[PDB]
């Protein structure tokens, strides 16, 4: 399948070179997989989700996304126009308030919720969790991310926006999950993206168009935006049978475009997520 005039980041993950605008992908499009977006919520009524998104948990007075960040990330995972895995099932877990903030205890509870809740959902091809959030190092936060991965969920986490070594942020610094840095449309490391040996992969993160609240769209930047590209890619690859939740991060790294990014500090992987699709 081919989607013309796609957002640059979708084109980039389906390509060996920058500068094109068509997203190429297998029509299965992540059907039968599930992705949990652990964030500010998801505006499930947005036409772009086509009834495939549901809020399943909140730790606040409402499950509504009053911010937009979570709706944007979910759109990159699985919206019809802006999403990597256009037929996946999206589940929203609101651990961040409408200002985008959250206590670590609430974030931890949200991760352990997903480890259990996946047993309440139909996800024959596998389960992914996308965590476009973080803060300073916390062993408890890292442990929660490791538990979620161990339970059989592919965990993708943002590296952080501190232009610093991600080893000092959580859950970015947990070795067993998939830590995602950000790149721009010219294959530069995004200027804010954290780096370091704990990164596993880069994805598109500068000027990413996706869904927003009020049935709208907008383009924003962050490692928060790169993470759902990798989460959606994992769901897509799991539906195709190419990998599993336990192995997807390594599979993505093994099949990535190698050595094509610029301003990669020494010691950080030079790997850009790639779906390896040949129509
Ligand atoms: Ca890993």
């Amino acid at each position: 399948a081919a989607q013309t005039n796609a957002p640059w980041g979708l084109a980039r993950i389906s390509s060996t070179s920058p500068g094109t605008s068509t997203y190429y992908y297998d029509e299965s499009a992540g059907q039968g997989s599930c992705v949990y977006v652990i964030d500010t919520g998801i505006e499930a009524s947005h036409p772009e989700f086509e009834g495939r998104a549901q809020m399943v948990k909140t730790y606040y007075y409402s499950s509504r996304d009053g911010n937009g960040h979570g709706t944007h990330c979910a759109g990159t995972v699985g919206s019809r126009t802006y999403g990597v895995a256009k037929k996946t099932q999206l589940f929203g877990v609101k651990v961040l308030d409408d200002n985008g903030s959250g206590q670590y205890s609430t974030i931890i509870a949200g991760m352990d919720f997903v480890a259990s809740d996946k047993n309440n959902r139909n996800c024959p091809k596998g389960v992914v969790a996308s965590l476009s959030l973080g803060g300073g190092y916390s062993s408890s936060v890292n442990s929660a991310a490791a538990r979620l991965q161990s339970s059989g969920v592919m965990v993708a986490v943002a590296a952080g926006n501190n232009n610093a070594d991600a080893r000092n942020y959580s859950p970015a610094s947990e070795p067993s999950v998939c830590t995602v840095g950000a790149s721009d449309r010219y294959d530069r490391r995004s200027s804010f993206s954290n780096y370091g040996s704990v990164l596993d992969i880069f994805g598109p993160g500068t000027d990413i168009l996706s869904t927003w609240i009020g049935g709208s769209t907008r383009s924003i930047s962050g490692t928060s935006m790169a993470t759902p590209h990798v989460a959606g890619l994992a769901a897509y690859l799991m539906t195709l049978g190419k990998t599993t939740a336990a192995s997807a991060c390594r599979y993505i790294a093994d099949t990535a475009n190698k050595g094509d990014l610029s301003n990669i500090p020494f010691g950080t992987v030079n790997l850009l997520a790639y779906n390896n699709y040949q129509a």
Side-chain angles (χ1 to χ4, degrees):
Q3 177 191 355
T4 52
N5 306 114
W8 77 263
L10 299 188
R12 188 74 196 79
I13 69 171
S14 59
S15 182
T16 52
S17 291
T20 68
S21 59
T22 305
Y23 177 38
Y24 304 112
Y25 62 97
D26 188 90
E27 289 81 349
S28 60
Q31 192 160 355
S33 65
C34 298
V35 184
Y36 286 82
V37 180
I38 304 171
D39 208 287
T40 63
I42 307 170
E43 186 174 279
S45 63
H46 199 304
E48 277 281 317
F49 298 121
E50 309 177 297
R52 293 180 289 100
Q54 293 279 340
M55 285 303 299
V56 300
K57 183 71 172 167
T58 182
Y59 296 94
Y60 304 88
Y61 64 80
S62 175
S63 65
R64 168 177 170 269
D65 181 9
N67 182 279
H69 182 270
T71 293
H72 195 276
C73 294
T76 297
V77 175
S79 71
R80 62 194 188 180
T81 305
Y82 311 102
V84 172
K86 296 178 186 304
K87 297 180 188 167
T88 194
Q89 293 278 306
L90 298 159
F91 297 117
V93 175
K94 179 169 175 62
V95 297
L96 299 181
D97 70 19
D98 288 338
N99 294 318
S101 298
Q103 293 296 316
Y104 270 171
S105 47
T106 299
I107 291 166
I108 289 166
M111 284 190 255
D112 285 326
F113 172 84
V114 175
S116 177
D117 184 71
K118 69 170 192 300
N119 297 305
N120 287 324
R121 312 297 166 187
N122 288 295
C123 311
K125 302 297 186 184
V127 184
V128 180
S130 194
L131 283 143
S132 291
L133 55 78
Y137 181 90
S138 160
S139 62
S140 293
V141 172
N142 282 10
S143 176
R147 287 193 297 278
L148 183 54
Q149 177 72 47
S150 166
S151 85
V153 174
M154 192 281 179
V155 181
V157 309
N161 72 334
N162 316 104
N163 190 30
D165 197 311
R167 72 198 295 161
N168 299 322
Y169 299 90
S170 290
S173 60
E174 166 52 38
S176 66
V177 303
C178 208
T179 301
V180 183
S183 64
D184 79 7
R185 69 175 79 238
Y186 285 101
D187 284 352
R188 315 181 183 101
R189 177 172 60 95
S190 303
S191 58
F192 48 76
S193 182
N194 287 346
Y195 53 83
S197 61
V198 80
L199 265 70
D200 299 289
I201 191 68
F202 281 84
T206 298
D207 296 333
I208 304 303
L209 177 60
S210 189
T211 41
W212 200 255
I213 55 170
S216 73
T217 59
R218 64 176 65 180
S219 177
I220 57 171
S221 300
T223 61
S224 287
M225 282 65 257
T227 300
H229 282 93
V230 174
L233 178 61
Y236 167 89
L237 294 169
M238 291 159 47
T239 288
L240 280 180
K242 299 284 196 180
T243 193
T244 65
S247 298
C249 191
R250 271 164 140 176
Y251 181 90
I252 290 170
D254 288 348
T255 58
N257 285 310
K258 311 186 176 55
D260 296 319
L261 300 173
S262 61
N263 197 20
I264 300 303
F266 197 84
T268 299
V269 295
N270 194 328
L271 298 172
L272 183 63
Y274 176 48
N275 74 357
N276 198 22
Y277 180 68
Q278 312 111 4

